[PDB]
Amino acid sequence: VAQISPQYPMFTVPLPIPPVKQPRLTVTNPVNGQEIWYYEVEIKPFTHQVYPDLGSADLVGYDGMSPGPTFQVPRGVETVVRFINNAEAPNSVHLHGSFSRAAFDGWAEDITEPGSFKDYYYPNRQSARTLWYHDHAMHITAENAYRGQAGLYMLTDPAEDALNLPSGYGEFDIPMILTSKQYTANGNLVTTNGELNSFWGDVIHVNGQPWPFKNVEPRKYRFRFLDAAVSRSFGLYFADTDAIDTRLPFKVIASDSGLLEHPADTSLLYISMAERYEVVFDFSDYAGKTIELRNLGGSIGGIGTDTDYDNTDKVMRFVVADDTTQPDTSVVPANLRDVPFPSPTTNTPRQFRFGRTGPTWTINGVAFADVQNRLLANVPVGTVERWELINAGNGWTHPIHIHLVDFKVISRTSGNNARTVMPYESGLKDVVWLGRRETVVVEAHYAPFPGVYMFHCHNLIHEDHDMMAAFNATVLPDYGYNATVFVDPMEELWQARPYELGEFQAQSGQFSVQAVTERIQTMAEYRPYAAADE
C-alpha cells in the first residue's frame, strides 16, 4: 500500500557503522585478580537529520546515538556497564543473548529513573555470538527501542577467529541492524504510543539510516543481521538490479546463540523481531554489479500479517567494485563448531498460548502486569524442558523470546501448511517466530543460574500490552553461590542509584576512579557467575 512517510532519496546515503564502545577503565576483581572492564553509557535525547530537506527527528539513545555504540568483548572478560539515565522516561537494559543474573537481565520492573544509574555486571562466558542491548522497561519498551535504545554487543572468541571467516568490524564484518519506522511530513518520527496492534513502519533502515548504499569489493563479507524493528518481520534475499527477482545464494553461519554446526545454503532469510542471523555473502561473482538487499512481500510470503508499503521491499544497495584492493584470504568452513545442544528429554512439554484476552496480548490468558498469575513455570536449575509455543491465530504472529536459555527448535507446525523448521534454525536460538497458525516446540537447558526471568513475544507492541510472563529457575536452600541475593531481580543491592549531573560530567563523587573501584570490587565479592566456573 501507499507509503505514508515522505519520499526519501533512496540509496544515496552510505551505510553508517556504529562506533565501538570503549571501557573507561578496568577494576581488579579481588576474587580472581582479573581485570573487569567498566563502561559508562549516558541515555540522552538528541536530534538526527533523517530527511535532508525536512526537520529533524527526536531520539533518545545510548551515548546520544542510534544505534547505540557496538560493544566488543572477548569471552572470559567480565564487564560492568553503568547505564546512566539522563532522559525523560525510565529505562531497564536487557543484554539479549546473555545468561546474566536476574537483577542484571533488564527485568521490566527493574527500572532506572532519570537522574539515576544502574551498574550491570555481565559474565561474557557463553559461545561467541551477536548480542544486542536494548530497553525493556515495563509498558514503554516499544517506544524506548523505537526512539533508539538498542545497540550491538559482539562476544568474540579466538577459537572462532581461527575459522578465518570475513573479519574486521566495519571492514568485511558489517553490522546490519534492521528497523522499520514511520515519519511525519516534517521528517520527525511517528510515535508508537497508543498503538495496541502492531507498528509496521513504512521506512526501512539499516544501522539507523533509511535505504542506504555501501561500496563493497567483489569478495566475501560477514553480515550480522538483527531485526531491531518494533513489529516488522522480514524475508531477506539479495538480487542483482539487472534481475531484481532472482535470489542470489548465500550462507547462514550463525543464529542467536552463535555458530551453526555447518553453514546453511540459503537464498531467502526469514528474520523476525530480536533474531540475529550472521550471513556470508560472496560478491566475487558480481564485480561491477549493484546487489539490492530486498524483503519478501505478501506479509513475508504469507508467514506473517505485516502491512507492505511501496518501499518495504527495499532494504539497501551494495555497489560491487570491478576489483579487490587485496586478495580475499577468508573462507567459510563446512565444519564451524560442535553446537552444545541440550540432552533430549521425553517429559511432556509445557504449553504456552500466545493470544488475546479482550484488547490485551496474553500468554495462557495472563497479562505480565497481573503479578499474581504471571509466574507460569518453576523449573529446577539443571532441568531440560520442552515448551510448546502455540499461535492459534491467523491475524497475528509472535516471535517468542526466552531469557536465560539457549534453545533448540525441535518442531514447527503451520495451520496454513506454510513451512516446518528452517535450515538456519538447525543450531541454538533464543527467539523463534510463530508465524500465522504456527506451533513450535523448543528444548532448553534451564541453566546455570537460579532466578526469576521473563519470556515474551518480541513484537514490542504485543510485549508492552502485555504479552510477557515469568519463569523461576529454582534451587534448594543449600545450593550456595549467594543464590539468596541473585534470585530476585528487584534485590536492593543491585537497584539503580541517584546521581548529580555535575559528578558524572566531572567524573567525581560516585564517578571517581576510587568510588567506581570500590563499587565494582564490592559487587565482584558476591561472585555472581561462579556457578558457571567449569
Ligand X SMILES: *[C@@H]1O[C@H](CO)[C@@H](O[C@@H]2O[C@H](CO)[C@@H](O[C@@H]3O[C@H](CO)[C@@H](O)[C@H](O[C@H]4O[C@H](CO)[C@@H](O)[C@H](O)[C@@H]4O)[C@@H]3O)[C@H](O)[C@H]2NC(C)=O)[C@H](O)[C@H]1NC(C)=O
Ligand Y SMILES: *[C@@H]1O[C@H](CO)[C@@H](O[C@@H]2O[C@H](CO)[C@@H](O)[C@H](O)[C@H]2NC(C)=O)[C@H](O)[C@H]1NC(C)=O
Residue ranges binding ligand NAD (CB under 6 A): 197, 356, 392-396
Cα–Cα distance measured from residue 69 to residue 89, given in angstroms and rounded to the nearest whole number: 20
Q: Is 94 annotated as a binding residue?
A: yes
Select the residue interacting with ligand Y from 168, 297, 365, 480 (CB under 6 A).
480
The H or E element spanning position 28 is strand 25-28
Q: 87 vs 475, which CB is nearer to ligand X?
A: 475
β pairing state of 438-445 and 384-390: antiparallel
Q: Are 460 and 431 in contact (CB under 8 A)?
A: no
Site string for ligand Y, 429-468 (x = CB under 6 A): ----------------------------------------
Stretch that binds ligand X, among 228-236, 270-278, 333-341, 467-475 (CB under 6 A): 467-475
Stretch that binds ligand Y, among 12-20, 102-110, 276-284, 521-529 (CB under 6 A): 521-529
Q: 214 vs 353, which CB is nearer to ligand NAD?
A: 353
Query: If binding is defined by CB under 6 A, does position 484 make contact with ligand X?
Result: yes
Residue 467 burial (CB < 10 Å; 0-12/13-18/19+)?
buried
C-alpha cell at 348: 511432556
The H or E element spanning position 517 is helix 513-525
Q: 172 vs 486, which CB is nearer to ligand Y?
A: 486
Cα–Cα distance measured from residue 458 to residue 363, given in angstroms and rounded to the nearest whole number: 13
The H or E element spanning position 194 is none
Q: Is 139 annotated as a binding residue?
A: no
Judged by the rule CB under 5 A, the positions of this chain that interact with Cu ion are 96, 274, 398, 403, 454, 457, 459, 462
Q: Is 403 annotated as a binding residue?
A: yes
Q: 57 vs 487, which CB is nearer to ligand X?
A: 487
Query: If binding is defined by CB under 6 A, does position 447 make contact with ligand X?
Result: no
Select the residue interacting with ligand X from 140, 163, 177, 452 (CB under 6 A).
452
Segment 229 to 268, residues that bind ligand Y, using CB under 6 A: none
- b/e string for 26-38 if b means 16 or more Cβ within 10 A? ebebeeeeeebbb
Stretch that binds ligand X, among 3-11, 132-140, 263-271, 471-479 (CB under 6 A): 471-479
Q: Is 176 annotated as a binding residue?
A: no
In the bound complex, what is the minimum distance in angstroms from residue 37's beta carbon to ligand Y? 20
C-alpha cell at 298: 505478501
Q: Which residues contact 533 (CB under 8 A, 6 or more apart)?
A: none
Q: What are phi and psi of 461, to 5 degrees?
A: -65, -45
Cα–Cα distance measured from residue 369 to residue 324, given in angstroms and rounded to the nearest whole number: 55
C-alpha cell at 506: 566531572
Number of H helices, E strands in the chain: 6, 32
DSSP track, 263-280: EEEES-EEE-TT-EEEEE
Q: Which residues contact 485 (CB under 8 A, 6 or more apart)?
A: 491, 493, 526
End-to-end Cα spacing for the chain: 55
Select the residue interacting with ligand X from 36, 108, 273, 487 (CB under 6 A).
487
Select the residue interacting with ligand Y from 481, 486, 499, 504 (CB under 6 A).
481
In the bound complex, what is the minimum distance in angstroms from residue 147's beta carbon to ligand NAD? 24
In the bound complex, what is the minimum distance in angstroms from residue 112's beta carbon to ligand Y? 23
Q: Which does 419 bind (CB under 5 to 8 A by kind): ligand X, ligand NAD, ligand Y, none?
A: none
| Residue whose C-beta lies closest to ligand X | 483
Q: 9 vs 382, which CB is nearer to ligand Y?
A: 382
Query: If binding is defined by CB under 6 A, does position 29 make contact with ligand Y?
Result: no
CB atoms near residue 380 (< 10 Å): 13
Q: 449 vs 481, which CB is nearer to ligand Y?
A: 481
C-alpha cell at 453: 526471568
Q: Which does 459 bind (CB under 5 to 8 A by kind): ligand NAD, Cu ion, ligand X, none?
A: Cu ion
Comparing C-alpha atoms, which of 155, 84, 80 is closest to residue 114? 84
The CA-based dihedral angle spanning residues 311, 315, 320, 326, taken in that order and rounded to the nearest 10 degrees:
170
Binding site for ligand Y (CB under 6 A): 480-482, 525-527, 530
Q: Which residues are part of a known binding site for Cu cation?
A: 94, 96, 134, 136, 398, 401, 403, 456-458, 462, 467
Binding site for ligand X (CB under 6 A): 375, 450, 452, 472, 474-475, 477, 483-484, 487
